[PDB]
Coordinates of C-alpha atoms and ligand atoms in Angstrom, one line a residue:
Chain A
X2 CA 84.8 8.3 -9.0
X3 CA 84.0 6.8 -5.4
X4 CA 85.0 3.3 -6.5
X5 CA 88.6 4.5 -7.2
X6 CA 88.6 6.2 -3.7
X7 CA 87.4 3.1 -2.0
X8 CA 90.1 1.0 -3.8
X9 CA 92.7 3.4 -3.2
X10 CA 92.2 4.4 0.4
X11 CA 94.1 2.8 3.2
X12 CA 94.6 2.9 7.0
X13 CA 97.4 5.4 7.5
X14 CA 100.2 3.9 9.9
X15 CA 102.0 7.3 10.0
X16 CA 101.2 10.9 9.7
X17 CA 103.1 14.0 8.5
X18 CA 103.0 16.5 11.3
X19 CA 103.8 19.5 9.0
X20 CA 100.7 19.1 7.0
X21 CA 97.6 20.5 8.6
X22 CA 94.1 20.6 7.2
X23 CA 93.1 23.8 5.5
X24 CA 90.4 25.9 7.0
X25 CA 87.9 24.6 4.4
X26 CA 88.9 21.0 5.0
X27 CA 88.4 21.5 8.9
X28 CA 84.9 22.8 8.2
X29 CA 84.2 19.9 5.8
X30 CA 85.1 17.2 8.1
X31 CA 82.8 18.6 10.6
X32 CA 79.9 18.7 8.0
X33 CA 80.4 15.1 7.2
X34 CA 80.1 14.3 11.1
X35 CA 77.0 16.4 11.3
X36 CA 75.2 14.9 8.1
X37 CA 75.5 11.2 8.6
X38 CA 72.2 9.3 8.7
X39 CA 71.2 7.5 11.9
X40 CA 68.0 5.4 12.9
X41 CA 65.0 7.5 13.3
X42 CA 67.4 10.6 12.9
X43 CA 68.3 10.0 16.4
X44 CA 71.7 11.2 16.0
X45 CA 72.8 9.6 19.3
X46 CA 76.3 11.0 19.2
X47 CA 78.8 13.5 20.3
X48 CA 82.1 14.5 18.6
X49 CA 85.4 15.7 19.9
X50 CA 87.6 17.6 17.4
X51 CA 91.0 18.2 18.6
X52 CA 93.3 20.2 16.5
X53 CA 95.6 22.0 18.9
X54 CA 98.6 20.0 20.5
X55 CA 97.1 20.5 23.8
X56 CA 93.9 19.1 22.6
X57 CA 95.5 16.2 20.8
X58 CA 97.7 15.4 23.9
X59 CA 94.6 15.1 26.1
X60 CA 93.3 12.5 23.5
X61 CA 96.5 10.8 23.5
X62 CA 96.5 10.0 27.2
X63 CA 94.2 7.2 26.3
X64 CA 96.7 5.6 24.1
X65 CA 99.3 5.5 27.1
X66 CA 100.4 1.9 28.3
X67 CA 99.1 -0.8 26.3
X68 CA 98.3 1.3 23.2
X69 CA 101.3 3.1 22.8
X70 CA 101.5 2.5 19.0
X71 CA 98.4 4.3 18.7
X72 CA 100.0 7.5 20.3
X73 CA 102.1 8.7 17.4
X74 CA 99.0 8.6 15.0
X75 CA 97.0 10.7 17.5
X76 CA 99.8 13.3 17.9
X77 CA 101.1 13.7 14.6
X78 CA 97.9 13.9 12.6
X79 CA 96.3 17.3 11.8
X80 CA 92.8 16.8 13.5
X81 CA 91.7 14.0 15.8
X82 CA 88.0 13.0 15.9
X83 CA 86.8 11.2 19.0
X84 CA 83.3 9.5 18.1
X85 CA 81.1 9.3 21.5
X86 CA 77.7 7.4 21.7
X87 CA 75.1 8.4 24.0
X88 CA 74.8 5.8 26.9
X89 CA 71.2 6.3 28.1
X90 CA 68.2 7.4 26.1
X91 CA 67.1 10.7 27.3
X92 CA 63.6 12.0 26.0
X93 CA 65.3 15.4 26.2
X94 CA 67.3 14.4 23.2
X95 CA 64.2 12.9 21.2
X96 CA 62.3 16.1 21.7
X97 CA 65.1 18.1 20.5
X98 CA 65.5 16.0 17.3
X99 CA 61.7 16.6 16.3
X100 CA 61.8 20.3 17.4
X101 CA 64.8 20.7 15.0
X102 CA 63.0 18.7 12.3
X103 CA 60.2 21.2 12.9
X104 CA 62.4 24.2 12.5
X105 CA 63.8 22.9 9.5
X106 CA 60.3 22.5 7.9
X107 CA 60.0 18.7 7.5
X108 CA 56.2 18.8 8.6
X109 CA 53.1 19.9 6.9
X110 CA 51.0 19.9 10.1
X111 CA 51.1 19.4 13.9
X112 CA 49.6 16.1 13.4
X113 CA 52.6 15.1 11.1
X114 CA 55.0 16.3 13.8
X115 CA 52.8 14.3 16.4
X116 CA 53.2 11.1 14.3
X117 CA 57.1 11.5 13.7
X118 CA 57.7 12.0 17.5
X119 CA 55.4 8.9 18.3
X120 CA 57.3 6.8 15.8
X121 CA 60.8 7.8 17.2
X122 CA 59.4 7.2 20.9
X123 CA 58.2 3.8 19.7
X124 CA 61.4 2.7 18.1
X125 CA 63.5 4.0 21.3
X126 CA 60.9 2.2 23.5
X127 CA 61.3 -1.2 21.6
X128 CA 65.2 -1.0 22.2
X129 CA 65.1 -0.1 25.8
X130 CA 62.2 -2.2 27.1
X131 CA 61.8 -5.1 24.8
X132 CA 65.3 -5.7 23.6
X133 CA 67.4 -4.2 26.4
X134 CA 69.8 -3.1 23.9
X135 CA 69.6 0.6 23.5
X136 CA 73.3 1.2 24.4
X137 CA 74.2 -1.2 21.7
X138 CA 71.7 0.2 19.4
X139 CA 73.0 4.0 19.8
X140 CA 76.7 2.6 19.6
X141 CA 75.8 0.9 16.1
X142 CA 74.6 4.2 14.7
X143 CA 78.0 5.8 15.7
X144 CA 79.8 3.1 14.0
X145 CA 77.6 3.9 10.9
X146 CA 79.0 7.6 11.3
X147 CA 82.3 6.4 11.2
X148 CA 82.0 4.2 8.1
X149 CA 80.4 7.4 6.5
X150 CA 83.3 9.5 7.8
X151 CA 86.3 7.5 6.4
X152 CA 84.8 7.2 3.0
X153 CA 84.1 10.9 2.9
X154 CA 87.6 12.1 4.1
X155 CA 89.2 9.7 1.7
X156 CA 87.2 11.5 -1.1
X157 CA 88.4 14.7 0.3
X158 CA 92.0 13.5 -0.5
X159 CA 92.8 13.0 3.2
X160 CA 94.5 10.3 5.1
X161 CA 92.7 8.8 8.2
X162 CA 92.7 5.7 10.4
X163 CA 90.1 4.5 12.7
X164 CA 91.3 3.4 16.1
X165 CA 89.7 1.1 18.7
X166 CA 93.1 0.6 20.1
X167 CA 92.9 3.2 23.0
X168 CA 91.6 3.1 26.7
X169 CA 88.0 4.1 26.7
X170 CA 87.8 4.5 30.5
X171 CA 90.8 7.1 30.3
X172 CA 89.4 9.0 27.5
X173 CA 86.0 9.1 29.0
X174 CA 87.5 10.6 32.5
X175 CA 89.7 13.0 30.6
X176 CA 86.9 14.7 28.9
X177 CA 84.2 13.9 31.7
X178 CA 82.0 12.0 29.4
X179 CA 80.5 9.5 31.9
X180 CA 78.5 12.4 33.6
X181 CA 77.6 14.0 30.3
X182 CA 76.0 10.6 29.4
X183 CA 78.6 9.6 26.6
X184 CA 81.1 6.9 26.0
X185 CA 83.9 7.2 23.6
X186 CA 83.9 4.4 20.9
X187 CA 86.5 5.3 18.1
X188 CA 89.3 7.8 17.7
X189 CA 89.9 8.8 13.9
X190 CA 93.3 11.0 13.3
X191 CA 92.9 12.7 9.9
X192 CA 95.8 14.4 8.1
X193 CA 98.4 13.5 5.5
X194 CA 100.4 10.3 5.5
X195 CA 104.4 10.5 5.7
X196 CA 106.9 8.7 4.1
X197 CA 107.0 6.1 7.0
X198 CA 103.5 5.0 6.4
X199 CA 104.4 1.5 5.2
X200 CA 100.7 0.7 4.5
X201 CA 100.5 3.2 1.7
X202 CA 102.4 0.9 -0.8
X203 CA 101.0 -2.4 0.3
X204 CA 98.1 -4.1 -1.8
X205 CA 94.6 -4.0 -0.2
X206 CA 93.4 -7.5 0.9
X207 CA 89.7 -8.5 1.1
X208 CA 88.2 -12.0 1.2
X209 CA 86.7 -12.9 -2.3
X210 CA 82.9 -12.2 -3.0
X211 CA 82.4 -15.9 -3.7
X212 CA 83.0 -16.3 0.2
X213 CA 81.0 -13.3 1.4
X214 CA 78.2 -12.5 -1.0
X215 CA 75.1 -14.5 -2.3
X216 CA 73.3 -13.4 -5.4
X217 CA 69.6 -14.4 -5.5
Chain B
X2 CA 82.5 16.8 -4.6
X3 CA 81.8 14.5 -1.6
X4 CA 80.4 17.0 0.8
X5 CA 77.6 18.0 -2.0
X6 CA 76.9 14.1 -2.0
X7 CA 76.5 14.0 1.7
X8 CA 74.3 16.9 1.9
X9 CA 72.2 16.0 -1.0
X10 CA 71.7 12.2 -0.5
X11 CA 68.6 11.3 1.4
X12 CA 66.6 8.2 2.6
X13 CA 64.4 7.3 -0.3
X14 CA 60.7 6.5 0.7
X15 CA 59.6 5.2 -2.7
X16 CA 61.5 3.6 -5.6
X17 CA 60.8 3.5 -9.4
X18 CA 60.4 0.0 -10.2
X19 CA 60.9 0.4 -14.0
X20 CA 64.4 2.0 -13.3
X21 CA 67.3 -0.6 -12.8
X22 CA 70.9 -0.5 -12.2
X23 CA 73.1 -0.6 -15.0
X24 CA 75.4 -3.8 -15.3
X25 CA 78.3 -1.9 -14.1
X26 CA 76.5 -0.2 -11.4
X27 CA 75.4 -3.6 -9.9
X28 CA 79.3 -4.6 -10.0
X29 CA 80.4 -1.3 -8.2
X30 CA 77.9 -1.6 -5.3
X31 CA 79.3 -5.2 -4.6
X32 CA 83.0 -3.8 -4.6
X33 CA 81.8 -1.1 -2.0
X34 CA 80.4 -3.9 0.1
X35 CA 83.8 -5.9 -0.3
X36 CA 86.3 -3.2 0.3
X37 CA 84.8 -1.7 3.5
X38 CA 87.4 -1.7 6.3
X39 CA 87.0 -3.4 9.7
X40 CA 88.8 -4.0 12.8
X41 CA 91.6 -6.1 12.1
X42 CA 90.4 -6.6 8.7
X43 CA 88.0 -9.1 10.2
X44 CA 85.3 -8.8 7.6
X45 CA 82.9 -10.6 10.0
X46 CA 80.0 -10.1 7.4
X47 CA 78.0 -11.9 4.7
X48 CA 75.7 -10.0 2.1
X49 CA 72.6 -11.1 0.3
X50 CA 72.1 -9.1 -3.0
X51 CA 68.8 -9.7 -4.4
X52 CA 68.0 -8.4 -8.0
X53 CA 65.3 -10.8 -9.2
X54 CA 61.6 -10.5 -8.5
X55 CA 61.8 -13.8 -6.7
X56 CA 64.8 -12.8 -4.7
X57 CA 63.3 -9.7 -3.5
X58 CA 59.9 -11.2 -2.6
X59 CA 61.8 -13.6 -0.4
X60 CA 63.3 -10.5 1.3
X61 CA 60.0 -8.8 1.5
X62 CA 58.6 -11.4 3.7
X63 CA 60.3 -9.8 6.6
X64 CA 58.3 -6.8 6.0
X65 CA 55.1 -8.0 7.5
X66 CA 53.0 -6.8 10.7
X67 CA 54.7 -3.7 12.3
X68 CA 57.0 -3.3 9.4
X69 CA 54.5 -3.2 6.4
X70 CA 55.8 0.3 5.2
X71 CA 59.2 -1.4 4.3
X72 CA 57.5 -3.7 1.9
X73 CA 57.1 -1.4 -0.9
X74 CA 60.6 -0.2 -0.7
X75 CA 62.0 -3.7 -0.8
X76 CA 59.9 -4.9 -3.7
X77 CA 60.1 -1.7 -5.8
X78 CA 64.0 -1.2 -5.7
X79 CA 66.3 -2.3 -8.4
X80 CA 68.7 -4.3 -5.9
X81 CA 68.2 -5.2 -2.4
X82 CA 71.3 -5.8 0.1
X83 CA 70.7 -7.4 3.3
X84 CA 73.6 -7.0 5.6
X85 CA 74.4 -9.9 7.8
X86 CA 76.9 -10.2 10.7
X87 CA 78.7 -13.5 12.1
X88 CA 77.1 -14.6 15.4
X89 CA 80.0 -16.8 16.7
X90 CA 83.7 -16.0 16.0
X91 CA 85.2 -19.1 14.3
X92 CA 88.9 -19.4 14.0
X93 CA 88.4 -21.0 10.5
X94 CA 87.5 -17.3 9.7
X95 CA 90.4 -15.8 11.1
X96 CA 92.9 -18.1 9.5
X97 CA 91.0 -17.3 6.2
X98 CA 91.6 -13.8 6.5
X99 CA 95.3 -14.0 7.4
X100 CA 95.8 -16.7 4.4
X101 CA 94.0 -14.1 1.9
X102 CA 96.2 -11.2 3.4
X103 CA 99.3 -13.4 2.4
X104 CA 98.2 -14.5 -1.0
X105 CA 97.8 -10.5 -1.7
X106 CA 101.1 -9.9 -0.8
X107 CA 101.1 -8.1 2.5
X108 CA 103.8 -9.9 4.3
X109 CA 107.4 -9.7 3.5
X110 CA 108.3 -12.9 5.9
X111 CA 106.5 -15.8 7.6
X112 CA 107.4 -14.0 11.2
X113 CA 105.4 -11.0 9.7
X114 CA 102.4 -13.3 8.8
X115 CA 102.5 -14.9 12.2
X116 CA 102.4 -11.6 13.9
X117 CA 99.5 -10.7 12.2
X118 CA 97.7 -13.5 13.0
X119 CA 98.9 -13.3 16.6
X120 CA 97.5 -9.8 16.7
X121 CA 94.3 -10.5 15.1
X122 CA 93.7 -13.6 17.6
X123 CA 94.5 -11.3 20.5
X124 CA 91.9 -8.7 19.5
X125 CA 89.3 -11.5 19.2
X126 CA 89.9 -13.1 22.3
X127 CA 89.7 -9.7 24.1
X128 CA 86.1 -9.3 22.9
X129 CA 85.0 -12.9 23.6
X130 CA 86.9 -13.9 26.7
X131 CA 87.3 -10.5 28.5
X132 CA 84.7 -8.2 27.5
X133 CA 82.1 -10.9 26.2
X134 CA 80.9 -8.7 23.5
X135 CA 82.1 -10.5 20.4
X136 CA 78.8 -10.6 18.6
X137 CA 78.3 -6.8 19.3
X138 CA 81.8 -6.0 18.1
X139 CA 81.2 -7.8 14.7
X140 CA 77.8 -6.2 14.4
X141 CA 79.5 -2.7 14.8
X142 CA 81.8 -3.5 11.9
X143 CA 78.8 -4.5 9.8
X144 CA 77.1 -1.0 10.7
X145 CA 80.4 0.7 9.6
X146 CA 80.2 -1.2 6.3
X147 CA 76.5 0.2 5.9
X148 CA 77.7 3.8 6.3
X149 CA 80.4 3.4 3.9
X150 CA 77.9 1.9 1.5
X151 CA 75.5 4.6 1.8
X152 CA 77.7 7.4 0.9
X153 CA 79.1 5.4 -1.7
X154 CA 75.9 4.5 -3.3
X155 CA 75.0 8.4 -3.4
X156 CA 78.2 9.1 -4.9
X157 CA 77.4 6.6 -7.7
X158 CA 74.2 8.8 -8.2
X159 CA 71.8 6.2 -6.8
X160 CA 69.1 6.1 -4.2
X161 CA 68.9 4.0 -1.1
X162 CA 67.3 3.9 2.3
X163 CA 68.7 1.8 5.1
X164 CA 66.0 -0.4 7.0
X165 CA 66.0 -1.6 10.6
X166 CA 62.3 -1.8 10.2
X167 CA 62.0 -5.7 9.3
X168 CA 61.6 -8.8 11.1
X169 CA 65.1 -10.4 11.4
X170 CA 63.8 -13.9 12.5
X171 CA 62.0 -14.1 9.5
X172 CA 64.7 -13.1 7.1
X173 CA 67.1 -15.5 9.0
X174 CA 64.7 -18.3 8.4
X175 CA 64.1 -17.5 4.7
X176 CA 67.7 -17.5 3.9
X177 CA 68.8 -20.0 6.6
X178 CA 71.2 -17.8 8.2
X179 CA 71.1 -19.1 11.8
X180 CA 72.6 -22.5 10.7
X181 CA 75.2 -20.6 8.7
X182 CA 76.3 -18.5 11.7
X183 CA 74.9 -15.2 10.6
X184 CA 72.2 -12.6 11.4
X185 CA 70.6 -10.2 9.3
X186 CA 70.9 -6.7 10.7
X187 CA 70.1 -4.0 7.9
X188 CA 68.3 -4.3 4.6
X189 CA 69.4 -1.4 2.1
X190 CA 67.1 -1.2 -1.1
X191 CA 69.1 0.6 -3.9
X192 CA 67.7 2.0 -7.0
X193 CA 66.2 5.2 -8.3
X194 CA 63.5 7.5 -6.4
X195 CA 60.1 7.8 -7.7
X196 CA 57.9 11.0 -7.9
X197 CA 56.1 9.6 -5.0
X198 CA 59.1 9.9 -2.7
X199 CA 58.2 12.4 -0.5
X200 CA 61.6 12.8 1.4
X201 CA 63.3 13.9 -1.9
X202 CA 61.8 17.4 -1.7
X203 CA 62.0 17.9 2.1
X204 CA 64.7 19.8 3.7
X205 CA 67.5 17.6 5.4
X206 CA 67.5 18.1 9.2
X207 CA 70.4 17.7 11.8
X208 CA 71.2 18.9 15.2
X209 CA 73.5 22.1 15.1
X210 CA 77.2 21.5 16.0
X211 CA 76.9 23.5 19.1
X212 CA 75.0 20.8 20.6
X213 CA 76.9 17.6 19.1
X214 CA 80.5 18.9 18.6
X215 CA 83.1 20.1 20.9
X216 CA 86.5 21.5 19.7
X217 CA 89.4 21.3 22.0
Ligands
FMN301 C1 86.3 0.0 13.7 C2 88.0 -0.2 13.2 C3 88.9 -0.3 14.3 C4 90.4 -0.2 13.9 N1 91.2 -0.1 14.9 C5 92.6 0.0 14.3 C6 93.7 0.2 15.4 O1 93.3 0.3 16.6 N2 94.9 0.4 15.0 C7 95.3 0.2 13.5 O2 96.3 0.3 13.4 N3 94.4 0.2 12.7 C8 93.1 -0.2 12.9 N4 92.2 -0.2 12.2 C9 92.5 -0.4 10.6 C10 92.2 -1.8 10.1 O3 93.1 -2.7 10.3 C11 91.9 -1.8 8.6 O4 90.8 -0.9 8.3 C12 91.9 -3.0 7.8 O5 92.9 -3.7 7.9 C13 91.4 -2.9 6.5 O6 92.6 -2.1 5.9 P1 92.2 -0.7 5.1 O7 91.6 0.2 6.2 O8 93.8 -0.1 4.6 O9 91.2 -0.8 3.9 C14 90.6 -0.3 12.6 C15 89.7 -0.4 11.5 C16 88.4 -0.3 11.9 C17 87.2 -0.4 10.8
FMN302 C1 70.5 2.3 10.8 C2 69.3 2.9 10.1 C3 67.9 2.4 10.2 C4 67.0 3.0 9.4 N1 65.6 2.3 9.3 C5 64.7 2.8 8.5 C6 63.5 2.2 8.3 O1 63.3 1.2 8.7 N2 62.7 3.0 7.6 C7 62.9 4.1 7.0 O2 61.9 4.7 6.3 N3 64.0 4.8 7.3 C8 64.8 4.2 8.0 N4 66.1 4.9 8.3 C9 66.1 6.3 7.6 C10 66.3 7.4 8.8 O3 65.0 7.8 9.3 C11 66.8 8.5 8.0 O4 68.4 8.1 7.8 C12 66.9 9.9 8.6 O5 65.8 10.4 9.2 C13 66.5 10.9 7.4 O6 67.6 11.3 7.1 P1 68.4 11.3 5.7 O7 67.4 11.3 4.4 O8 69.5 12.1 5.7 O9 68.7 9.7 5.7 C14 67.2 4.2 8.7 C15 68.4 5.1 8.9 C16 69.4 4.2 9.6 C17 70.8 4.9 9.7
NIO303 O1 64.3 5.9 10.7 C1 63.1 5.5 10.6 O2 62.1 5.9 10.0 C2 62.9 4.1 11.3 C3 64.0 3.5 12.0 C4 63.9 2.2 12.6 C5 62.6 1.6 12.3 N1 61.6 2.3 12.0 C6 61.7 3.5 11.2
NIO304 O1 93.0 -3.4 12.9 C1 94.0 -3.3 13.6 O2 95.2 -3.0 13.4 C2 93.6 -3.2 15.2 C3 92.5 -3.3 15.7 C4 92.0 -3.3 16.9 C5 93.1 -3.1 17.9 N1 94.4 -2.8 17.3 C6 94.6 -2.9 16.3

């Protein structure tokens, strides 16, 4: 059951390099990434999935220097996912989203399609013109995908760890993200933990509900 | 299987008001909220869980004006969760987190406790003093909790919808959040969909992976 998974999952501190995802697991993690929800189904994201040693080495360049403890995680995991957010809101993307919704058969009429597009544009306009927070808004949706992903991969029986401990400017330059209109936010290595993962046997710790939660 | 869950879940557009969470499901959703991961185990969040008519009516005040379509969802769902983020980083919270980790038995020595606290404080200081983005950073963690929650509730067999379509200023004032140092970000009604939920029978739509995903 999913509660057992939420209580048993942990942030892996060390991965077993000999243990690779099955072909089926590799496809499943890509499905999890794709099918996350997002505000207005905006999907304001790109994913880099590194599974070769060369690919993972390129991602790990971002952990050089101050983030050296992140490096082994990045190199030793089977697959490494880099979660990127769109930095500017392009109208091309919004059209792409609604054209895909149309192709998938979500609209009964042209008028329903037009209304969906109008709603999405309105929301995007509120964030960019009224709140001046569109970059933040898009990044929040990516963090939502990360949360979905971490629970999903645990429910597949895989070990993972979310990493903010890397240099985003280096990762951006390594993959040319700035010019494509993306920024890297979170790196998530995925695989199986090794016997050196000290966190696997430690109790989980959270604040009590009487501190964080009010019932009304 | 979790992939089936991710592919079958949907944003509910209409709830069945007669269909309530079981007592056990109500406890399980609160556990999901508590046990989400967060950067540095910072847990920079508060949750309001409304299950009474009075409670849910208070939340639904925020679905006024531009947000009237959110009102039915908030009133008709069994339980409504408001996800709030801390707005100022208080040192009291950071001390509380590490004191809880200590009580749960995560540290072998006083030196390991001190190092954990030092790391957490360093990270918090980078966001507040160097990046000037601490509010954004805390809100990102709450969105991560939301993504965890949405998949978890689906795996429990419950329907949900995430809502950004509400008036946060009204919700903040209704519960006195500003003075407590929180801001409401996302409202998630939880329950069972009704036969009027038009989204339950529509195909799910996402951009193809050849647009959103690069393998390296
Ligand atoms: C957004 C995010 C960023 C994180 N960054 C790191 C990181 O850079 N290095 C690391 O060792 N752990 C990292 N963690 C793991 C957290 O410390 C961990 O989630 C938290 O202590 C709760 O423990 P758990 O994940 O075992 O439940 C990160 C977690 C999240 C959610
Ligand atoms: C952060 C967030 C905010 C959302 N806000 C709303 C909302 O205000 N009203 C609504 O009807 N749906 C809202 N949605 C639902 C999205 O439109 C939805 O996730 C997506 O279009 C439909 O895909 P799904 O059925 O896979 O969730 C929100 C989704 C997310 C992730
Ligand atoms: O996804 C939606 O339908 C949505 C998102 C934000 C605001 N209003 C609607
Ligand atoms: O949670 C952690 O261990 C963490 C978070 C950010 C950066 N470095 C470490």
